[PDB]
């Protein structure tokens, strides 16, 4: 199952990936309990976190995940989704494509879309309101609902 993108890996897939890596790269044994999480979580760990969890292999595992298996882009997709409620993997990926992988810009664009649908105001108004509220969508969304 590791052929799938890491964002879809289950916790069991993460454990299997570690077993595969230890075999493939002749790593020192990695305890199966080292990363008790799914692939989404794995993508959010920093290199320092990987080194802390695995002093012997953490940097290798991080590089493989982030810079070979597409973790870098998939982490950006997660950031976008976690920043804007109800965005799908596809929607986030598309938004990032539009900004050349710029997470801040993609998030702003999706916030404006979400606010725009909350009321009958123009897209230009939604942009002004969001910028006014320092891009706090929750605060902007409450103003719009209040009318």
Tab-separated table of N, CA and C in Angstrom:
chain	number	residue	atom	x	y	z
A	1	UNK	N	0.773	-1.225	0.000
A	1	UNK	CA	0.000	0.000	0.000
A	1	UNK	C	0.815	1.291	0.000
A	2	UNK	N	2.126	1.228	0.249
A	2	UNK	CA	2.955	2.440	0.312
A	2	UNK	C	3.075	3.171	-1.036
A	3	UNK	N	2.701	2.533	-2.150
A	3	UNK	CA	2.697	3.190	-3.456
A	3	UNK	C	1.779	4.403	-3.453
A	4	UNK	N	0.771	4.396	-2.590
A	4	UNK	CA	-0.153	5.515	-2.486
A	4	UNK	C	0.547	6.743	-1.935
A	5	UNK	N	-0.023	7.917	-2.179
A	5	UNK	CA	0.564	9.151	-1.681
A	5	UNK	C	0.561	9.127	-0.139
A	6	UNK	N	1.624	9.651	0.506
A	6	UNK	CA	1.654	9.608	1.970
A	6	UNK	C	0.447	10.216	2.681
A	7	UNK	N	-0.231	11.181	2.080
A	7	UNK	CA	-1.376	11.837	2.705
A	7	UNK	C	-2.503	10.834	3.000
A	8	UNK	N	-2.523	9.717	2.268
A	8	UNK	CA	-3.553	8.660	2.407
A	8	UNK	C	-3.067	7.499	3.283
A	9	UNK	N	-1.792	7.471	3.689
A	9	UNK	CA	-1.287	6.345	4.477
A	9	UNK	C	-2.004	6.259	5.810
A	10	UNK	N	-2.451	5.049	6.164
A	10	UNK	CA	-2.971	4.771	7.489
A	10	UNK	C	-1.799	4.631	8.447
A	11	UNK	N	-2.111	4.482	9.728
A	11	UNK	CA	-1.101	4.219	10.771
A	11	UNK	C	-0.416	2.873	10.497
A	12	UNK	N	-1.155	1.873	10.010
A	12	UNK	CA	-0.545	0.604	9.651
A	12	UNK	C	0.407	0.779	8.452
A	13	UNK	N	0.023	1.628	7.493
A	13	UNK	CA	0.890	1.912	6.342
A	13	UNK	C	2.198	2.577	6.778
A	14	UNK	N	2.114	3.510	7.733
A	14	UNK	CA	3.300	4.148	8.296
A	14	UNK	C	4.241	3.107	8.896
A	15	UNK	N	3.698	2.178	9.692
A	15	UNK	CA	4.516	1.113	10.259
A	15	UNK	C	5.163	0.236	9.179
A	16	UNK	N	4.418	-0.050	8.109
A	16	UNK	CA	4.953	-0.855	7.016
A	16	UNK	C	6.061	-0.106	6.271
A	17	UNK	N	5.874	1.203	6.094
A	17	UNK	CA	6.867	2.039	5.443
A	17	UNK	C	8.185	1.998	6.219
A	18	UNK	N	8.097	2.078	7.547
A	18	UNK	CA	9.282	2.000	8.394
A	18	UNK	C	9.999	0.655	8.240
A	19	UNK	N	9.233	-0.444	8.190
A	19	UNK	CA	9.812	-1.772	7.968
A	19	UNK	C	10.485	-1.853	6.599
A	20	UNK	N	9.830	-1.291	5.584
A	20	UNK	CA	10.387	-1.274	4.243
A	20	UNK	C	11.709	-0.491	4.245
A	21	UNK	N	11.713	0.669	4.901
A	21	UNK	CA	12.880	1.541	4.879
A	21	UNK	C	14.053	0.872	5.601
A	22	UNK	N	13.775	0.211	6.730
A	22	UNK	CA	14.846	-0.420	7.482
A	22	UNK	C	15.527	-1.499	6.636
A	23	UNK	N	14.729	-2.259	5.867
A	23	UNK	CA	15.221	-3.275	4.942
A	23	UNK	C	15.969	-2.658	3.752
A	24	UNK	N	15.322	-1.699	3.081
A	24	UNK	CA	15.860	-1.073	1.874
A	24	UNK	C	17.185	-0.349	2.092
A	25	UNK	N	17.317	0.297	3.256
A	25	UNK	CA	18.435	1.182	3.549
A	25	UNK	C	19.378	0.653	4.630
A	26	UNK	N	19.147	-0.590	5.073
A	26	UNK	CA	19.984	-1.246	6.087
A	26	UNK	C	20.082	-0.392	7.343
A	27	UNK	N	18.934	0.120	7.789
A	27	UNK	CA	18.882	0.976	8.954
A	27	UNK	C	18.911	0.120	10.201
A	28	UNK	N	19.305	0.743	11.310
A	28	UNK	CA	19.195	0.117	12.623
A	28	UNK	C	17.712	-0.089	12.920
A	29	UNK	N	17.335	-1.099	13.735
A	29	UNK	CA	15.919	-1.371	13.974
A	29	UNK	C	15.164	-0.132	14.473
A	30	UNK	N	14.005	0.122	13.867
A	30	UNK	CA	13.112	1.186	14.272
A	30	UNK	C	11.926	0.523	14.959
A	31	UNK	N	11.701	0.847	16.236
A	31	UNK	CA	10.576	0.286	16.987
A	31	UNK	C	9.262	0.691	16.323
A	32	UNK	N	8.355	-0.283	16.155
A	32	UNK	CA	7.064	-0.079	15.486
A	32	UNK	C	6.219	1.038	16.118
A	33	UNK	N	6.480	1.333	17.399
A	33	UNK	CA	5.797	2.383	18.148
A	33	UNK	C	6.432	3.776	18.024
A	34	UNK	N	7.434	3.922	17.144
A	34	UNK	CA	8.174	5.176	16.986
A	34	UNK	C	7.299	6.310	16.421
A	35	UNK	N	6.421	5.976	15.469
A	35	UNK	CA	5.517	6.930	14.834
A	35	UNK	C	4.085	6.404	14.874
A	36	UNK	N	3.419	6.594	16.016
A	36	UNK	CA	2.049	6.132	16.226
A	36	UNK	C	1.069	7.165	15.669
A	37	UNK	N	0.956	7.183	14.338
A	37	UNK	CA	0.169	8.188	13.645
A	37	UNK	C	0.004	7.769	12.204
A	38	UNK	N	-0.926	8.435	11.511
A	38	UNK	CA	-1.110	8.207	10.090
A	38	UNK	C	-0.219	9.134	9.244
A	39	UNK	N	-0.360	9.032	7.923
A	39	UNK	CA	0.499	9.747	7.005
A	39	UNK	C	0.337	11.246	7.061
A	40	UNK	N	-0.908	11.707	7.227
A	40	UNK	CA	-1.193	13.126	7.420
A	40	UNK	C	-0.350	13.680	8.561
A	41	UNK	N	-0.354	12.990	9.704
A	41	UNK	CA	0.424	13.417	10.861
A	41	UNK	C	1.930	13.378	10.574
A	42	UNK	N	2.357	12.318	9.894
A	42	UNK	CA	3.754	12.120	9.610
A	42	UNK	C	4.284	13.325	8.823
A	43	UNK	N	3.454	13.837	7.913
A	43	UNK	CA	3.815	14.973	7.068
A	43	UNK	C	4.042	16.277	7.822
A	44	UNK	N	3.478	16.397	9.032
A	44	UNK	CA	3.593	17.612	9.819
A	44	UNK	C	4.794	17.634	10.770
A	45	UNK	N	5.461	16.484	10.936
A	45	UNK	CA	6.635	16.406	11.799
A	45	UNK	C	7.784	17.156	11.146
A	46	UNK	N	8.562	17.873	11.953
A	46	UNK	CA	9.740	18.549	11.451
A	46	UNK	C	10.897	17.555	11.382
A	47	UNK	N	11.979	17.949	10.702
A	47	UNK	CA	13.165	17.109	10.647
A	47	UNK	C	13.713	16.859	12.050
A	48	UNK	N	13.694	17.892	12.900
A	48	UNK	CA	14.113	17.759	14.297
A	48	UNK	C	13.257	16.717	15.048
A	49	UNK	N	11.949	16.698	14.771
A	49	UNK	CA	11.047	15.698	15.361
A	49	UNK	C	11.406	14.294	14.901
A	50	UNK	N	11.677	14.135	13.601
A	50	UNK	CA	12.138	12.854	13.085
A	50	UNK	C	13.431	12.387	13.770
A	51	UNK	N	14.405	13.291	13.927
A	51	UNK	CA	15.702	12.988	14.590
A	51	UNK	C	15.477	12.616	16.061
A	52	UNK	N	14.561	13.302	16.742
A	52	UNK	CA	14.240	13.020	18.161
A	52	UNK	C	13.644	11.611	18.278
A	53	UNK	N	12.698	11.273	17.398
A	53	UNK	CA	12.005	9.957	17.401
A	53	UNK	C	12.970	8.858	16.952
A	54	UNK	N	13.803	9.140	15.944
A	54	UNK	CA	14.775	8.187	15.443
A	54	UNK	C	16.146	8.832	15.291
A	55	UNK	N	17.003	8.813	16.334
A	55	UNK	CA	18.334	9.404	16.213
A	55	UNK	C	19.142	8.767	15.073
A	56	UNK	N	18.957	7.470	14.831
A	56	UNK	CA	19.766	6.766	13.851
A	56	UNK	C	19.339	6.986	12.397
A	57	UNK	N	18.046	7.243	12.177
A	57	UNK	CA	17.489	7.228	10.828
A	57	UNK	C	16.536	8.358	10.471
A	58	UNK	N	16.227	9.224	11.439
A	58	UNK	CA	15.183	10.213	11.295
A	58	UNK	C	15.416	11.148	10.123
A	59	UNK	N	16.647	11.637	9.967
A	59	UNK	CA	16.935	12.560	8.871
A	59	UNK	C	16.732	11.900	7.510
A	60	UNK	N	17.175	10.644	7.372
A	60	UNK	CA	16.977	9.862	6.155
A	60	UNK	C	15.487	9.713	5.834
A	61	UNK	N	14.703	9.337	6.847
A	61	UNK	CA	13.276	9.113	6.679
A	61	UNK	C	12.565	10.401	6.269
A	62	UNK	N	12.917	11.513	6.911
A	62	UNK	CA	12.352	12.847	6.581
A	62	UNK	C	12.646	13.189	5.115
A	63	UNK	N	13.892	13.029	4.696
A	63	UNK	CA	14.267	13.412	3.345
A	63	UNK	C	13.483	12.611	2.328
A	64	UNK	N	13.385	11.305	2.571
A	64	UNK	CA	12.650	10.410	1.710
A	64	UNK	C	11.191	10.838	1.600
A	65	UNK	N	10.525	11.010	2.742
A	65	UNK	CA	9.129	11.396	2.751
A	65	UNK	C	8.857	12.746	2.074
A	66	UNK	N	9.630	13.765	2.459
A	66	UNK	CA	9.358	15.146	2.030
A	66	UNK	C	9.818	15.441	0.621
A	67	UNK	N	11.033	14.987	0.296
A	67	UNK	CA	11.702	15.428	-0.913
A	67	UNK	C	11.783	14.395	-2.038
A	68	UNK	N	11.330	13.163	-1.779
A	68	UNK	CA	11.248	12.121	-2.806
A	68	UNK	C	9.817	11.635	-3.018
A	69	UNK	N	9.111	11.343	-1.918
A	69	UNK	CA	7.754	10.791	-1.982
A	69	UNK	C	6.613	11.827	-2.042
A	70	UNK	N	6.971	13.107	-2.188
A	70	UNK	CA	6.031	14.182	-2.443
A	70	UNK	C	5.422	14.798	-1.202
A	71	UNK	N	6.065	14.568	-0.054
A	71	UNK	CA	5.604	15.100	1.209
A	71	UNK	C	5.536	16.619	1.265
A	72	UNK	N	6.474	17.296	0.592
A	72	UNK	CA	6.511	18.758	0.599
A	72	UNK	C	5.197	19.346	0.107
A	73	UNK	N	4.740	18.898	-1.065
A	73	UNK	CA	3.492	19.399	-1.616
A	73	UNK	C	2.306	18.959	-0.766
A	74	UNK	N	2.349	17.719	-0.267
A	74	UNK	CA	1.218	17.188	0.474
A	74	UNK	C	1.053	17.887	1.811
A	75	UNK	N	2.167	18.293	2.424
A	75	UNK	CA	2.136	19.116	3.659
A	75	UNK	C	1.484	20.472	3.349
A	76	UNK	N	1.791	21.082	2.201
A	76	UNK	CA	1.174	22.349	1.837
A	76	UNK	C	-0.328	22.190	1.648
A	77	UNK	N	-0.746	21.087	1.016
A	77	UNK	CA	-2.167	20.782	0.861
A	77	UNK	C	-2.844	20.718	2.236
A	78	UNK	N	-2.222	20.015	3.189
A	78	UNK	CA	-2.750	19.932	4.553
A	78	UNK	C	-2.833	21.290	5.236
A	79	UNK	N	-1.823	22.077	5.102
A	79	UNK	CA	-1.873	23.419	5.672
A	79	UNK	C	-3.068	24.195	5.150
A	80	UNK	N	-3.277	24.167	3.840
A	80	UNK	CA	-4.391	24.876	3.254
A	80	UNK	C	-5.720	24.377	3.826
A	81	UNK	N	-5.903	23.056	3.858
A	81	UNK	CA	-7.122	22.456	4.385
A	81	UNK	C	-7.352	22.792	5.835
A	82	UNK	N	-6.274	22.802	6.624
A	82	UNK	CA	-6.380	23.077	8.053
A	82	UNK	C	-6.619	24.558	8.339
A	83	UNK	N	-6.325	25.412	7.356
A	83	UNK	CA	-6.520	26.847	7.478
A	83	UNK	C	-7.904	27.327	7.008
A	84	UNK	N	-8.540	26.570	6.104
A	84	UNK	CA	-9.845	26.906	5.534
A	84	UNK	C	-10.803	25.717	5.609
A	85	UNK	N	-11.853	25.844	6.429
A	85	UNK	CA	-12.782	24.750	6.704
A	85	UNK	C	-13.517	24.274	5.461
A	86	UNK	N	-13.546	22.952	5.265
A	86	UNK	CA	-14.331	22.329	4.212
A	86	UNK	C	-13.700	22.313	2.827
A	87	UNK	N	-12.375	22.470	2.771
A	87	UNK	CA	-11.618	22.374	1.530
A	87	UNK	C	-11.136	20.930	1.377
A	88	UNK	N	-11.309	20.370	0.174
A	88	UNK	CA	-10.864	19.015	-0.159
A	88	UNK	C	-9.414	19.029	-0.623
A	89	UNK	N	-8.790	17.844	-0.656
A	89	UNK	CA	-7.414	17.692	-1.144
A	89	UNK	C	-7.276	18.276	-2.545
A	90	UNK	N	-8.241	17.961	-3.415
A	90	UNK	CA	-8.233	18.423	-4.800
A	90	UNK	C	-8.333	19.947	-4.871
A	91	UNK	N	-9.286	20.514	-4.127
A	91	UNK	CA	-9.489	21.959	-4.078
A	91	UNK	C	-8.236	22.700	-3.587
A	92	UNK	N	-7.584	22.153	-2.555
A	92	UNK	CA	-6.377	22.750	-1.999
A	92	UNK	C	-5.244	22.662	-3.003
A	93	UNK	N	-5.093	21.486	-3.618
A	93	UNK	CA	-4.041	21.260	-4.592
A	93	UNK	C	-4.212	22.210	-5.779
A	94	UNK	N	-5.457	22.393	-6.234
A	94	UNK	CA	-5.737	23.265	-7.366
A	94	UNK	C	-5.369	24.711	-7.022
A	95	UNK	N	-5.752	25.149	-5.816
A	95	UNK	CA	-5.477	26.505	-5.349
A	95	UNK	C	-3.976	26.789	-5.275
A	96	UNK	N	-3.207	25.803	-4.806
A	96	UNK	CA	-1.758	25.895	-4.719
A	96	UNK	C	-1.129	25.962	-6.101
A	97	UNK	N	-1.659	25.171	-7.040
A	97	UNK	CA	-1.228	25.226	-8.427
A	97	UNK	C	-1.344	26.625	-8.985
A	98	UNK	N	-2.464	27.285	-8.672
A	98	UNK	CA	-2.744	28.630	-9.150
A	98	UNK	C	-1.766	29.686	-8.632
A	99	UNK	N	-1.154	29.438	-7.470
A	99	UNK	CA	-0.236	30.396	-6.856
A	99	UNK	C	1.229	29.949	-6.916
A	100	UNK	N	1.511	28.909	-7.712
A	100	UNK	CA	2.855	28.368	-7.859
A	100	UNK	C	3.416	27.792	-6.565
A	101	UNK	N	2.533	27.215	-5.742
A	101	UNK	CA	2.907	26.573	-4.492
A	101	UNK	C	2.989	27.510	-3.301
A	102	UNK	N	2.453	28.728	-3.461
A	102	UNK	CA	2.447	29.752	-2.419
A	102	UNK	C	1.262	29.503	-1.501
A	103	UNK	N	1.555	29.018	-0.290
A	103	UNK	CA	0.531	28.630	0.667
A	103	UNK	C	-0.274	29.822	1.178
A	104	UNK	N	0.413	30.918	1.509
A	104	UNK	CA	-0.262	32.108	2.023
A	104	UNK	C	-1.306	32.619	1.024
A	105	UNK	N	-0.917	32.729	-0.253
A	105	UNK	CA	-1.798	33.236	-1.302
A	105	UNK	C	-2.981	32.315	-1.575
A	106	UNK	N	-2.718	31.005	-1.600
A	106	UNK	CA	-3.771	30.024	-1.825
A	106	UNK	C	-4.831	30.086	-0.706
A	107	UNK	N	-4.372	30.206	0.545
A	107	UNK	CA	-5.268	30.323	1.694
A	107	UNK	C	-6.141	31.578	1.597
A	108	UNK	N	-5.524	32.718	1.287
A	108	UNK	CA	-6.261	34.001	1.119
A	108	UNK	C	-7.338	33.830	0.045
A	109	UNK	N	-6.991	33.223	-1.094
A	109	UNK	CA	-7.955	33.053	-2.172
A	109	UNK	C	-9.142	32.196	-1.745
A	110	UNK	N	-8.865	31.110	-1.023
A	110	UNK	CA	-9.927	30.225	-0.579
A	110	UNK	C	-10.779	30.865	0.537
A	111	UNK	N	-10.166	31.704	1.373
A	111	UNK	CA	-10.918	32.432	2.397
A	111	UNK	C	-11.914	33.401	1.779
A	112	UNK	N	-11.463	34.133	0.761
A	112	UNK	CA	-12.327	35.031	0.017
A	112	UNK	C	-13.486	34.263	-0.615
A	113	UNK	N	-13.211	33.124	-1.246
A	113	UNK	CA	-14.281	32.321	-1.824
A	113	UNK	C	-15.294	31.958	-0.764
A	114	UNK	N	-14.835	31.494	0.390
A	114	UNK	CA	-15.753	31.019	1.412
A	114	UNK	C	-16.608	32.164	1.943
A	115	UNK	N	-15.977	33.314	2.199
A	115	UNK	CA	-16.686	34.487	2.693
A	115	UNK	C	-17.700	34.986	1.661
A	116	UNK	N	-17.284	35.015	0.391
A	116	UNK	CA	-18.132	35.435	-0.716
A	116	UNK	C	-19.469	34.681	-0.764
A	117	UNK	N	-19.432	33.374	-0.488
A	117	UNK	CA	-20.642	32.551	-0.500
A	117	UNK	C	-21.496	32.690	0.765
A	118	UNK	N	-20.914	33.258	1.825
A	118	UNK	CA	-21.624	33.487	3.077
A	118	UNK	C	-22.702	34.570	2.955
A	119	UNK	N	-22.530	35.504	2.009
A	119	UNK	CA	-23.471	36.613	1.800
A	119	UNK	C	-23.628	36.964	0.319
A	120	UNK	N	-24.349	38.062	0.049
A	120	UNK	CA	-24.585	38.575	-1.296
A	120	UNK	C	-23.633	39.711	-1.680
A	121	UNK	N	-22.680	40.034	-0.794
A	121	UNK	CA	-21.643	41.077	-1.030
A	121	UNK	C	-20.798	40.679	-2.244
A	122	UNK	N	-20.080	41.639	-2.830
A	122	UNK	CA	-19.183	41.368	-3.947
A	122	UNK	C	-17.917	40.682	-3.454
A	123	UNK	N	-17.149	40.130	-4.395
A	123	UNK	CA	-15.834	39.502	-4.099
A	123	UNK	C	-14.880	40.606	-3.612
A	124	UNK	N	-14.958	41.803	-4.203
A	124	UNK	CA	-14.138	42.942	-3.775
A	124	UNK	C	-14.395	43.355	-2.320
A	125	UNK	N	-15.665	43.326	-1.902
A	125	UNK	CA	-16.039	43.606	-0.520
A	125	UNK	C	-15.451	42.547	0.402
A	126	UNK	N	-15.563	41.278	-0.005
A	126	UNK	CA	-15.053	40.170	0.805
A	126	UNK	C	-13.552	40.322	1.012
A	127	UNK	N	-12.842	40.726	-0.047
A	127	UNK	CA	-11.413	40.962	0.053
A	127	UNK	C	-11.090	42.073	1.069
A	128	UNK	N	-11.839	43.176	1.023
A	128	UNK	CA	-11.623	44.338	1.929
A	128	UNK	C	-11.907	43.902	3.368
A	129	UNK	N	-13.019	43.196	3.568
A	129	UNK	CA	-13.435	42.774	4.894
A	129	UNK	C	-12.387	41.835	5.504
A	130	UNK	N	-11.931	40.852	4.724
A	130	UNK	CA	-10.938	39.902	5.221
A	130	UNK	C	-9.635	40.594	5.597
A	131	UNK	N	-9.153	41.484	4.722
A	131	UNK	CA	-7.923	42.225	4.997
A	131	UNK	C	-8.083	43.072	6.261
A	132	UNK	N	-9.276	43.647	6.441
A	132	UNK	CA	-9.571	44.458	7.613
A	132	UNK	C	-9.459	43.643	8.895
A	133	UNK	N	-9.948	42.401	8.850
A	133	UNK	CA	-9.954	41.462	10.002
A	133	UNK	C	-8.674	40.620	10.030
A	134	UNK	N	-7.610	41.062	9.350
A	134	UNK	CA	-6.318	40.396	9.424
A	134	UNK	C	-6.450	38.927	9.004
A	135	UNK	N	-7.332	38.686	8.027
A	135	UNK	CA	-7.559	37.379	7.430
A	135	UNK	C	-8.128	36.340	8.400
A	136	UNK	N	-8.721	36.817	9.498
A	136	UNK	CA	-9.475	35.970	10.402
A	136	UNK	C	-10.821	35.736	9.744
A	137	UNK	N	-10.960	34.571	9.105
A	137	UNK	CA	-12.184	34.207	8.425
A	137	UNK	C	-13.344	34.087	9.412
A	138	UNK	N	-13.075	33.580	10.623
A	138	UNK	CA	-14.124	33.433	11.628
A	138	UNK	C	-14.760	34.798	11.976
A	139	UNK	N	-13.910	35.819	12.163
A	139	UNK	CA	-14.353	37.176	12.503
A	139	UNK	C	-15.077	37.849	11.334
A	140	UNK	N	-14.523	37.679	10.132
A	140	UNK	CA	-15.141	38.204	8.929
A	140	UNK	C	-16.493	37.538	8.667
A	141	UNK	N	-16.563	36.219	8.894
A	141	UNK	CA	-17.784	35.449	8.654
A	141	UNK	C	-18.902	35.837	9.625
A	142	UNK	N	-18.512	36.339	10.800
A	142	UNK	CA	-19.493	36.743	11.801
A	142	UNK	C	-20.062	38.113	11.478
A	143	UNK	N	-19.225	38.993	10.938
A	143	UNK	CA	-19.672	40.296	10.519
A	143	UNK	C	-20.657	40.159	9.395
A	144	UNK	N	-20.338	39.325	8.421
A	144	UNK	CA	-21.170	39.083	7.251
A	144	UNK	C	-22.513	38.484	7.668
A	145	UNK	N	-22.482	37.498	8.563
A	145	UNK	CA	-23.731	36.904	9.030
A	145	UNK	C	-24.567	37.929	9.789
A	146	UNK	N	-23.940	38.660	10.718
A	146	UNK	CA	-24.655	39.704	11.448
A	146	UNK	C	-25.346	40.685	10.505
A	147	UNK	N	-24.870	40.789	9.262
A	147	UNK	CA	-25.431	41.698	8.253
A	147	UNK	C	-24.870	43.113	8.366
